[PDB]
Amino acid sequence: DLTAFREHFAKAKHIAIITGAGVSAESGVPTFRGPGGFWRKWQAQDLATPEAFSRDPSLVWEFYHYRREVMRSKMPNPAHLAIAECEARLGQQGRSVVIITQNIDELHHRAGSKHVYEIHGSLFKTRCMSCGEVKANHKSPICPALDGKGAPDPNTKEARIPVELLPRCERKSCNGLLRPHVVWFGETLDSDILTAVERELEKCDLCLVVGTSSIVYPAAMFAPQVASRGVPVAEFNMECTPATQKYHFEGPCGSTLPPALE
Amino acid sequence: GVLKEYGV
Ligand SMILES: *C(=O)C[C@@H](C)C(=O)O
Numbered sequence: 001d002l003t004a005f006r007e008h009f010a011k012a013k014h015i016a017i018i019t020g021a022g023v024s025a026e027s028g029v030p031t032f033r034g035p036g037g038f039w040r041k042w043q044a045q046d047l048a049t050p051e052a053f054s055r056d057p058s059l060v061w062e063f064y065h066y067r068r069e070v071m072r073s074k075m076p077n078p079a080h081l082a083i084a085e086c087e088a089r090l091g092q093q094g095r096s097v098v099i100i101t102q103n104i105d106e107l108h109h110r111a112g113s114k115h116v117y118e119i120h121g122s123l124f125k126t127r128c129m130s131c132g133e134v135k136a137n138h139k140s141p142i143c144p145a146l147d148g149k150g151a152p153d154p155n156t157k158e159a160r161i162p163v164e165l166l167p168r169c170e171r172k173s174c175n176g177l178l179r180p181h182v183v184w185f186g187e188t189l190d191s192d193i194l195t196a197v198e199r200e201l202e203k204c205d206l207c208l209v210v211g212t213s214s215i216v217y218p219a220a221m222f223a224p225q226v227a228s229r230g231v232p233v234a235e236f237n238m239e240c241t242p243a244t245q246k247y248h249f250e251g252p253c254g255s256t257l258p259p260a261l262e
Numbered sequence: 263g264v265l266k267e268y269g270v
């Protein structure tokens with residue numbers, strides 16, 4: 001029941017909001033996973049790996065160029081905003097709001113969220129393979145060689161770009177090859193971040209799960225910790241729960257959430 | 263370090 005949720009809402013001083021792919025989906029962002037989530041031949045499992053990058057970096061960067069570019073036309077949905085404005089509203093009252101997101105499209109930032117933790121990184125950050133420097137980057141195209149590349153249709157010609165023309169680290173001391181600062185399959189989450197999040201979750205007195213369920217990664221690393229403290233937890237997603245039954249507001253975040261946070 | 267989606 002919504003009323004009941006809202007009563008907790010008003011009381012809460014430290015809200016933590018975990019956000020999954022559902023919320024990026026509603027802004028039309030592709031995730032390249034499950035049926036018909038394709039980019040040329042591949043799904044993300046195929047390309048989002050250290051091995052793919054080591055093996056064919058041009059191809060991977062093509063993939064990522066595309067993703068960077070299709071972002072120019074996808075905007076934050078109402079859920080992104082309702083969150084951001086919440087954070088703003090409550091911050092003024094000295095109540096905190098933090099965002100822990102597995103999404104890498106920077107939509108929450110563009111919505112005006114501030115206290116955000118991007119635990120899979122971000123398409124608009126690079127990491128130098130040589131020196132390890134992490135830098136913001138929204139340039140379009142990220143490098144000339146990549147101009148108008150990364151077409152999605154299966155039959156596109158590979159651009160087969162020489163490594164030295166792919167994006168390179170601007171400290172010429174170094175000039176290492178840049179990769180997208182994103183967590184790939186088979187890599188580990190930055191532990192500095194996980195510690196911060198642990199801390200935030202420990203501190204929190206109401207927890208929201210949006211566009212994913214507590215039952216799955218990554219919500220499942222934590223929701224158990226917070227729940228075992230007795231803190232209430234609300235899911236918002238397109239999922240269903242069994243006739244015989246934490247709160248759950250089935251439906252699009254875009255619709256479910258803004259009323260919930262007013 | 264925690265594996266993205268636990269390595270499933
Ligand atoms: C994890 O799902 C994010 C990463 C694998 C990507 O390349 O999108």
Ligand SMILES: [Zn+2]
Nearest residue numbers: 128131169174
């Ligand atoms: Zn470098």
